[model samples]
Target: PIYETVGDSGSKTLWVVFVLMLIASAAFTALSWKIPVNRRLYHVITTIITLTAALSYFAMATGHGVALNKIVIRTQHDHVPDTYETVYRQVYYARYIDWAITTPLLLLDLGLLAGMSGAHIFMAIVADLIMVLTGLFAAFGSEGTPQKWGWYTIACIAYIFVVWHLVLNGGANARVKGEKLRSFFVAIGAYTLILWTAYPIVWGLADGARKIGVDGEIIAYAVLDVLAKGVFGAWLLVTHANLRESD
Candidate 1:
């Protein structure tokens, strides 16, 4: 009763929040050019993130978004008790749609920062893509069924692989580079991992169990979106500039 029970209004709110954040990200990305010599790759990274968010906003705005539904179904014979079941499911599949494009760039930015090998980065990005795609599938999958959670588990597992490579492998590589660079990577890398890990938990609460309801889910995800992409983008860009000066 407190939170918006309707999925459409929640989605529209998210669209506005994400668009504002995305526009700011694009602006910051453009301003990164003023730094000189270290702006190209950073621009590419932010550009992809901004584009994905922008497109996702359009998706929600255009009605290609997740919707919340409530329905009742017969659960038993024509008897009296245990004859009906009511449930709720939420689908904002466009979130995963955006992640499919943006997540790889997220990985790439950090991968380049870590100086990870081309082959490894490619493989990691592939894993990241699977994570997002599988999550999308889970959102649209039959609710209250094993198949739904199956896809969710698959996505989470792939996400783990991504986290492992970024922190244990690629991140270590970055730390070995130089003191200033290592300092930058350590802080930002930790921040990224923590924020990203929280995504799955929130996913479970939002679309998986519908525990948070539509409005609550949007608020949760909107905060995460800004932190994951916007704040992370800005912090990463600043660290990269510092790394450039060290070089």
Candidate 2:
């Protein structure tokens, strides 16, 4: 009876989704023991279960996201990631992982199982969408406007991850350390920070747009992203390249 109640942040509500996944995983594990029967379906179900658990993790990041944003905006106004704003995402993160990252694994795994054509394309798109919404949701404008989007946008972002795998050009190994294709993932990770880094620029532009020397928010964001991507990304590339060339 105590477990049935939702918490102030509402994360407890998500446990149902997780529980469903555990059951699904169990069912698939049982089915996996049998041969020649819908192995693909069983695998797909397993992937879904795994994805659901990941969503729970993403949601938990919300609080940290806000705290980080605040630190950035207040200390470094030129560019920042995470702001001192956005309570909902904070609550969501404090509660559980979001549904976007979790709910789409069924299709991704099913495609692999069924050998569905262009399935890779779907995963790639979904991956891009996930970062987009995550970055977008991570944005904290000010106390007045938290820069929130509907769940539809978040869902759309997660859906884009399916095609994400296909676009990497290096197969499933793009994420590996020192892999030639690892640059792509590094670029992506850097860009995720890059997106959040836009806040200070936005704040600056909006506050100064009408002034004689007002600069563009997007321009500042682009410059900072380039520098960030260049410095941090360059270091990563150099390190990886050295490791790779040595091998």
Candidate 3:
């Protein structure tokens, strides 16, 4: 089987992203120390998010926790019959593992900020897990078969529930918290939603349709991860601190 995988440049990009995650982790951890341990919930959660991403990126950079997925592509010819080619593309399962753990923690941060109930938070986290797991399944599913798209469809539907929880349910709950929290939630939550939406678009182009190379996929996710985890964490912690300081 012909293999289409990450090259040297792609590996370098992963390493750079891993280094960025480490820096973000250290920054968040340092910030956590400035506040009382009792009030360090967001800081602690944010630190864990970057830390987990760092580890996942480390594994991916080192070529661990990755598999080559076999796919079939059809080529058209002008004066002859079309040909079918078999190609194997690299897929990083480590990303799904990272998402499985960190996305729940991310939701926990948002849920607490919005003052959502434990039951509602738990339901949203479960939906997020389903989304990540189904996405993983879709990545490994046989190409040219409905099974792959079926899993993708399930994942997409699960994502809708997550957005509903964060935007609709969370927004309502945030309104009860007060004007300050509501505004912060709208800003940061919208930032998160936009980044989260890009993940599927990247997936559709990379794994779903094979339109982009593995290097492009790596770079895209790297940027999204930094923004989603590192920048998002800093913003959340700083705003939370400001809110508390005013109280």
Candidate 4:
């Protein structure tokens, strides 16, 4: 049977997003040169985040990092027995690759800003890797089975640990730095938290529940990727420049 996948419109969108990511990567690279090499920790990391994303987007846009996952949909009728339909949906494995690399870098940026200990930051990065890996497992899990959701639950639990380290632990440490730093941390941290939380919701609708089509999934993720990577990097770098003392 033919699998449900991206059409021409979706491919066009993917191409556009790929170009956008490239632009963001180049901009970040150029911006990094403005600061001294010693102070370019966040700048270098920020540039890499987008560079990795750009590569992932290129892979996805060119249809090199996608696979089809089987989905079993059940239908019930009053006059007839239940019926099951099996369909395949396109899953972009490249996105997971992007997340696995970029999310930890994102945490590193936030953790350093909050003055978190290296050990705590290491733990957070490990938990984030677990989250992305489990999400990938869930995406490729057998359809109409509890196993898929089981992986999802594990991913969600790992995300909780990430949030704990970022908000509860990192927040406390940020306060020790100063009120201004704390305020900035709170604002940016909240922004990150809200955006990151949306990932699972989108997954539930697009991949798990099949409530949205492939195009919808592509567009939703494209929006999230731009904000989370491009916008977040810009905000972090700009603010970090002004708050150099925090570093």
Q: lDDT values of the candidates?
A: 0.75, 0.37, 0.89, 0.89
lDDT of 4: 0.89
Worst 10 residues of 1 by lDDT: 1-10
Alpha-carbon TM-score of each model against the true structure:
0.85, 0.35, 0.95, 0.95
Q: Candidate 1: what lDDT?
A: 0.75
Candidate 4 per-residue lDDT, tens place, 23-58, comes to: 887878777788888888888888898888888888
Clash pairs detected, candidate 3 = none
Better of 1 and 2 by TM-score: 1
Query: How should the candidates be ordered by lDDT, best one leading?
Result: 3, 4, 1, 2
lDDT of each residue in 1-247, candidate 1, tens digit only = 1223546667677668757766866677676667665446776677678767877867766667767655454565555665666675556777877888888888888778877889989989988998988887777677666777999999999998998888777867886787777777778888888888888998888766666876777777777878888788777766566567323
- Better model by lDDT, 1 or 4? 4
- Clashing pairs in model 4, backbone N/Cα/C closer than 3 A: none
Model 4 residue 223 lDDT score: 92
**Which has the higher TM-score value, candidate number 2 or candidate number 3?**
3
